[PDB]
Amino acid sequence: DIMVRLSPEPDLARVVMDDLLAPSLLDVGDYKIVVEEGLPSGCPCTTQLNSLAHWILTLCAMVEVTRVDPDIVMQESEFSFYGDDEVVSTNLELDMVKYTMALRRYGLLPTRADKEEGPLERRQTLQGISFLRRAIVGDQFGWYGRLDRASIDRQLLWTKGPNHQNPFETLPGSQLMALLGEAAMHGEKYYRTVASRVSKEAAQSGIEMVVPRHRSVLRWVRFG
Amino acid sequence: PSGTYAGLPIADYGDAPPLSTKTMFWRTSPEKLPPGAWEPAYLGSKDERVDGPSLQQVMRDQLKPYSEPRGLLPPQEILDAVCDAIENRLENTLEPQKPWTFKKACESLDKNTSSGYPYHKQKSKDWTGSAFIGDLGDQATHANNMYEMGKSMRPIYTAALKDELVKPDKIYGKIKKRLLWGSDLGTMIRAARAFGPFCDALKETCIFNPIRVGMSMNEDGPFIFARHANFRYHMDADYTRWDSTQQRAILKRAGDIMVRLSPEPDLARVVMDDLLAPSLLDVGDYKIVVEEGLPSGCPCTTQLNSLAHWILTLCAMVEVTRVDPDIVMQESEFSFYGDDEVVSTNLELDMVKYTMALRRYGLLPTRADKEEGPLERRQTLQGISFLRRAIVGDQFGWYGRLDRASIDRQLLWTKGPNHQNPFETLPGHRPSQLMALLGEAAMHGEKYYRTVASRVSKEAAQSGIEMVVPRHRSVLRWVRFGT
Amino acid sequence: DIMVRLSPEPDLARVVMDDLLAPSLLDVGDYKIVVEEGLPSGCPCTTQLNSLAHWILTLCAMVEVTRVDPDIVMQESEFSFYGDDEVVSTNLELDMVKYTMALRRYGLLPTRADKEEGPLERRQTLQGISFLRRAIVGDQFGWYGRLDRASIDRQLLWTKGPNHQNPFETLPGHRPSQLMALLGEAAMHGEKYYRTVASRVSKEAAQSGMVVPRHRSVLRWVRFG
């Protein structure tokens, strides 16, 4: 309804949204079944819609805990929503017990990092939080998001290509420089490791590639 | 052979010898023990002090914790960052070393301990003063050739029980005897050649790095404690079952650090992979498979354990404070000797969440009052314990002082050959240990020094020769300030 | 008196100290004059003696200011004395006004770093204070004393040799250990200054007839080694 009211052609978007949010027909191959609830995550705009829903739910929980009007929360808070992914920063003293209780009451499934039962954790610093598979870090140059180490090693182990049946087939056929950049934000040690791996790899395939110094590629990815 | 021994899988049959029923501790005088005094641990079915279980049952009781579910692993980003920080600090601190020869690795071993599998022979029985010969010589040569070839060998550990003075409740009440891991000569030599350079280079910087393995309390102690006292808050977690509760992944990170700093990294990688693989412990009846815990048999096991302790502590502090590990490391001073720690820091640490993260990692920290709850944090270094010493400070500086009870114990008990009745009086020599005891007693004042001096004079005037009991001030100056 | 009473032959040392502290005969070339006061800084022990005097004076001022006993001062404080050079660390709440007043009353001439009149400055951190012409610095590895930059550049500009008249004459002689020690002292200032000093040393070695290590190796050698 928000998206329609904010659209330049509200009646046509109203019809399209009513069609989108009606009980959906999912084709599982054998039959077409009717899914009445959940999110139909197929449409191109589904990410914005999902993010707006996340925003609504979060604000609702905070108004249920603080009992103050949503504008008060929203002027005292900064939200970041990408579908199911969130980062919530706020100045209000939030009772995390009741916050988690209200979240679980809505049907949601919030989880602690230790995967144990109990209330959600709130920290006094943004460092360490994860967003878009990256960790939020800060230094004398400012804040940044750095891809975790597992994803870098993983993309060093696997490359994308045409569809095949045995995942352990080696492909006899860019991304390496992006991996080098993402590894530069982890220090000179990990950069040296990744640089050795890429140098050994690219000398077994295609063409040679310059392996920059840590400081140069770090400068390029941080301050472009 | 299949089955389950003490909750742990069975792999093969046991070639280990029977558990020792003797003790090395002798009484110094035929007088009656004071009530509540300490006595050597339970000695088996032949122990005439109590009727207790078999030593096999006590070893089973000590092996039960190794079957227990592990704790949670720290967050991966924190772990990677802290391991990189530790490795970088060691690179900045450690002096590069030259690879160890077979001769140097063979001369580094203690020849008064068992060779382990398969001979269980005292190393000195096949020692020439230069290299190994005989059975132990062939074992050593095979281990060395496999080391040079970069080929893997699986270590076979031998289980034993520790002979030591324990509180009487551990003898006349619920009987307990600490579990010891002995290693085989081949694995000893492999680990020596691999990590001798690293351990020695770490020992040369026992003052500037928290791994305090190899330090001398009387010479290097005061500096360590002044460095600690430069900081605001001080704590000691005093973990219970440190080795049983360790996770092999943390030990693998520590071993990666130890290998990356070694002069022969490819060979040390193979040796560490062999050390940290599922361990084969020989409990006498069977050879069982211990998949987790710490195999505390190898010569480098102390450095490895200390590094793991460092990793875990830093991880917990970074998980609570969310500040970078190097920032912690310049705002903190650690002292680690295996399971023993002293942590000094300026950061305002939420001891509740700190203890929560520690218990989440599988560790078992205990309060001083032995009651459950959060860890204690103090604003002074005074009272903290490290290497069985108490940290004290005065106008001359800081120092480590042996407790009074330990002094009384060493006055009551002396080490000698293995016997069956701990209350037998030793007719033999301790002319050197006694002077050290006099020095340790001097740090308690002239009264306690007079008492200890009376006891020493009485003990040496009823036996052998004698010695001149120096003035309090002279021996105090001698033990405090190097002479 | 302290130094004599602690010597193994106190009666023999007494006469020598009485001779040392008596009105001194200073030879200024034309005459031998009588210096009744001051410190005769010629004897081998003159530094220790001076330092002991420094100790006394410092302690006196503090007990005159704090009104607490000197042994309590000394167990609640840490002193460092090298003749006229000192570093005083203490936990006592010290009125720097009365401290400087008592020092100037004793004939001493304490000076601020900014060369302005007023009481002495006390800081809550040991970092930055100077002792033996070196600065006290601390890092994640511990504390250390590092020679200032000006002295390093000066020793790069000036070298010791035989006595001559024109200070701007260039010495034609071809210094190993001196330059290596200078490289070490420059290493404790960071890789930037170490690179500059290393370039200067190499350039000064291309006019004569060593291995210039990486910063980290020499840094570890001079810090821990």
Residue numbers in the entry:
A (entry chain B): 263 to 435, 441 to 491
B (entry chain E): 8 to 436, 439 to 492
C (entry chain C): 263 to 436, 439 to 473, 476 to 491
Study text:
Next, we determined the complex structure of RdRp-VPg(1-73) at 3.1 Å resolution. Continuous electron density was observed at the base of the palm domain of RdRp in the initial map. Two helix backbones (α1 and α2) modeled for VPg were fitted to the electron density with lower B factor, which was verified by examining a simulated annealing composite omit map at the 1.2σ level. However, the electron densities for the side chains of VPg were not well defined, whereas those of RdRp were clearly interpretable. MNV VPg had a distinct helix-loop-helix conformation and bound to the palm domain of RdRp, and the binding site was relatively similar to that of EV71 RdRp but far from that of VPg at the active site of FMDV or the thumb domain of CV RdRps. The electron density for the oligo(A)8 RNA was not visible in the complex structure, despite the presence of the oligonucleotide in the crystallization solution. A large ball-like hexameric arrangement of RdRp was observed in the crystal structures. A face-to-face contact of the palm domains was capable of forming a dimeric structure, and the trimer interface was largely made up of the thumb and fingers domains in the hexameric complex. The crystal structure of the MNV RdRp-VPg(1-73) complex showed a more tightly packed arrangement of RdRp molecules than that of RdRp molecules themselves; a hexamer of RdRp molecules was surrounded compactly by six neighboring hexamers and this was mediated by specific binding of VPg(1-73). Further, the interactions between RdRp molecules in the RdRp-VPg(1-73) complex were distinct from that of the native; interactions between Arg329 and Gln389 and between Asp91 and Arg411 of adjacent RdRp molecules were observed in the RdRp-VPg(1-73) complex structure but absent in the native.
Norovirus (NoV) is a positive-sense single-stranded RNA (+RNA) virus belonging to the Caliciviridae family. ORF1 encodes a polyprotein that is cleaved into non-structural proteins, including virion protein genome-linked (VPg) and RNA-dependent RNA polymerase (RdRp). VPg covalently attached to the 5′ end of viral RNAs plays crucial roles in viral protein translation and genome replication. Moreover, the crystal structure of the complex provided the evidence that the interaction between VPg and RdRp plays a crucial role in NoV replication through the higher-order multimer formation of RdRp molecules.
